[PDB]
Copies of this chain bind each other. A is one copy, B any other.
Amino acid sequence: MDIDPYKEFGATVELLSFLPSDFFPSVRDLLDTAAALYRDALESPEHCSPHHTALRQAILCWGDLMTLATWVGTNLEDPASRDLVVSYVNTNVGLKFRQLLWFHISCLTFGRETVLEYLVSFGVWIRTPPAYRPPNAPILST
Contact = CB atoms under 8 A, between A and B. Distances in A.
The contact size tier of chain A is 35 or more
Contact of A36 (B14, B36, B142): B14
A139 B133 contact: yes
Interface string A1-41: 11111011111101101101011111001111111110110
Contact of A39 (B14, B42, B52, B120): B14
14 contacts: A8-B53, A12-B37, A15-B33, A17-B32, A18-B35, A18-B36, A22-B131, A33-B124, A61-B64, A68-B68, A77-B81, A121-B140, A121-B141, A136-B136
A128 B39 contact: no
A77 to B, nearest CB: 7
A30 B14 CA distance: 10
